[PDB]
């Protein structure tokens, strides 16, 4: 990794970070407390793994600050924030830009799966948009890498595959993210969070485990048919019935090319 | 009553409110928890000393004895006996492995301490590996690091002028329900998860993804994964933990009942 120092920056919490020589970046300070040196080795290894994720649709980890009792992650800056914010903005997104966004999400998820990363929390809060309306996948909640995830701990459920609802012990798979992505598709075309009421509880968890899905009739903007088919397929209760992201890409890229671009 | 001590009774300390190893000029090593550093207040002083006398009356070989109280202008401190090897989770994750007989004894000693506290009308409310301390001989003592048992030092800790929370062991009836009164059955549930953690050498629910997910899952019956125990674990201990984390509090045994079952078992198959 690149190791940064707090003194490298102008003077969990997610903040704008001005590196005194490299400029604008994003700082997430994961932990500030009395020491835990016994953990550093595993944290720096996972950080290196973080550092190796290099893709235009994936948020890049610029540096780590590993200091006595202070753990921080430094990331590349995305101007326009997360996908939900851009969707609900006062202006609109042509269907072509939404098609391109969806393809970019597929490409990033396929890259992450090809590097052995299961995101575990794909959701609109974790899809960042740059000034040109291109996206990058992020992990604001530290869900993807286990030791940084624990250190962070030393919360929407709307995108959680039903197999993880009321069952925290089953191991998540690539199909977990495929389910999340399906709900992301719906949300992209609804410009709102699923389950119109927008309350989370045991009623809804049990409803979803039994097959309830976001209301396809709650789409009040135009949504292409093939995309509705794709999301319906991807949120199948049976994890085995859901495609892989490379399969999704072999389907969606030619459709986006022929009908959307 | 208690022993009221002075800050000047100690030569020095080293940080571990603030928890410190402190050297008493006459008594030697002790553990100091400094609860409040601020402007002076008698807003509780009388009750505070009363509560101290109360926590001083807990005298049992498996409970951390309160050694002294420091009540000074703007400074409030509790002083406890020192436990050499720290808390149970740390000892479990140590490089050297712990013999199944020693884990059996630890479990029995926890049972004994919990029985004592319940027999003196004390509901711990926060039993967990962090509150189970280990001496140099691998004997345990139950502690209350979070000031859960005595409410007004707890208030003093949170008073807005003082310059100075795991849920894996919280019985499901108190999750997302901040009003339910904890009972002895709560402490039994905590004991059940501590048993699991003793034999898995780690915290439960590692692939839990989000806190609401885990909270709703646990309230609906999810428990620690018994297969994730990868070292030998006797079958009655699996039975005991399954019984003690029963969703219905009434179905859970009591600590005198747990001890009745477990002590002969430990004698005949473990010691
Ligand atoms: C309103 C706001 C101020 C704005 O306007 N823009 C803006 N907000 C952010 C927030 C982050 C951000 C924050 C915290 C992060 C991450 C990113 C991240 C990460 O992505 N890790 C990579 C390596 C990864 C990706 C996929 C899977 C696994 C790991 C890990 N954490 C903890 C980054 C850029 N921006 N830009
Ligand atoms: C791990 C460290 C790095 C190391 O190496 N050793 C080490 N840490 C400690 C920490 C304590 C400790 C700290 C804070 C406490 C308490 C104890 C306590 C209490 O137990 N009160 C008694 C009377 C009681 C017991 C049961 C129920 C109700 C009350 C109340 N508070 C706020 C004691 C001994 N050690 N030894």
Curated annotation (Swiss-Prot), chain A:
The chain holds residues 9 to 294 of 671 of the full protein. It comes from the Eukaryota. Changing residue 64 to I: In a colorectal adenocarcinoma sample; somatic mutation. Coiled coil: none annotated. The modification Phosphoserine is found at residues 144, 149. Belongs to the protein kinase superfamily. TKL Ser/Thr protein kinase family. The RIP homotypic interaction motif (RHIM) mediates interaction with the RHIM motif of RIPK1. Both motifs form a hetero-amyloid serpentine fold, stabilized by hydrophobic packing and featuring an unusual Cys-Ser ladder of alternating Ser (from RIPK1) and Cys (from RIPK3). The death domain mediates dimerization and activation of its kinase activity during necroptosis and apoptosis. It engages other DD-containing proteins as well as a central (intermediate) region important for NF-kB activation and RHIM-dependent signaling. This is Receptor-interacting serine/threonine-protein kinase 1. It is found in: Cytoplasm; Cell membrane. It comes from Homo sapiens. Disulfide bonds: none annotated.
